Symmetry: D2
Subunit: 115 residues, 4 copies
Amino acid sequence: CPLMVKVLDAVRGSPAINVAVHVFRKAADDTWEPFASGKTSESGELHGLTTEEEFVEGIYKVEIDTKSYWKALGISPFHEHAEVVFTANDSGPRRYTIAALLSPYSYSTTAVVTN
Amino acid sequence: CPLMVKVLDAVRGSPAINVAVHVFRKAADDTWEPFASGKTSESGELHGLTTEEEFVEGIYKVEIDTKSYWKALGISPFHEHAEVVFTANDSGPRRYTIAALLSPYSYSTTAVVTN
Amino acid sequence: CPLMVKVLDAVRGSPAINVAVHVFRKAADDTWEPFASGKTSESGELHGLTTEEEFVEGIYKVEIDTKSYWKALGISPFHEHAEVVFTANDSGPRRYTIAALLSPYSYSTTAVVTN
Amino acid sequence: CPLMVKVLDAVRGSPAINVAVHVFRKAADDTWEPFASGKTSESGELHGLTTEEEFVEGIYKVEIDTKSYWKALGISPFHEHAEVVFTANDSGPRRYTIAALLSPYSYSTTAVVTN
Ligand SMILES: O=c1c(-c2ccc(O)cc2)coc2cc(O)cc(O)c12
Ligand SMILES: O=c1c(-c2ccc(O)cc2)coc2cc(O)cc(O)c12
């Protein structure tokens, strides 16, 4: 698992469950092309998006459908989604955890990069 | 003024109005002594807590009554308050803005230090 | 003004000065069209992006060039930028403050919506 | 494990390792009495602070020594520490994760409450 996504809910104090997540990689004509997707589990985690072989250096976008999440809970949200855009670099072996903390009118995102 | 507190509500996307704020200063005997207090305004800001003459070097505590805020909106929050503890003016007089962003189960705090 | 952007540096405890900000609006053909741009001031604020006449209903994107900011301070950051995407003015004209708090491997964004 | 603490570093994009954490419970004379402590592991986590039998309803404080952490990395910090103060309540079976995201001049904390 070179890439994992974890989503938390700051209103309820819980994992954010069944949140749709899409991953894109930047193409040479500088358009975004779909790469991987899924929904967060009961622990708010999304595992198995990609493999070591496929996850090469490049520019990636992780888009989290926060609007549909808040809509399901009956709470008015501000953002259309949360986008996280980064360059993946080989130095040594790497694992990426993209964590997002969600509120209706705010979100925070951090990258935890290990190995 | 040397010390200002600004509080935001991450659920409503608004200033957090009428929030109680209590400031304490550490004495020589290592106890917390009452220093200043007030309520946030319509803009979520609290000005005029202290003066340049009064705000000497020391360790200060700013305690924001987040629990009473959430409860008056019908929400039972996780935290009792948001507490910020810091050493002030140790390389000379500065101006401090203490900002807090509030959610029922989470908060962030930042300091902007100038001059 | 209808739209203001404020950027803070969580490492230095200061406004984030000279930060590039680009605003886009979604067209009928679903592409992003350039709307407005500017640089944050000494206070980390960007005022005067648009007017009440120009800032109609739609989906907007605010892209903050966080990478160039960190690089000029000698830090190689994780994210390419901080991107905020939202529907504006759909229940009538409002005033929007978009705040971003920056760290090399993390950022938070909040909206304060009034009037 | 009814109570776990997890600490992240927003400057380096990593677990915050070897951070001292102290837990207190509020006594009837309203003084803070030490309860449990330890240091975060290589994954930034602190497990085994207490047991189901000992962790009764009450008011608790978790104090994270953020200042010593930043000092070890050679970076000037603002806060003396991060304090998280909450009421533990029995409803159904509960697990508490107190997560903290650290920057030199800012911190965020969230509670993830499960089972
Ligand atoms: O710090 C903030 C924040 C802010 C943003 C993100 C956070 O995590 C915390 C506070 C929001 O609006 C402001 C508005 C201000 O006028 C001054 C500020 O310092 C802030
Ligand atoms: O809460 C977080 C955060 C996190 C993210 C943003 C914040 O503002 C605060 C914490 C990051 O990684 C985690 C990773 C975890 O396994 C559990 C968590 O609760 C978190």
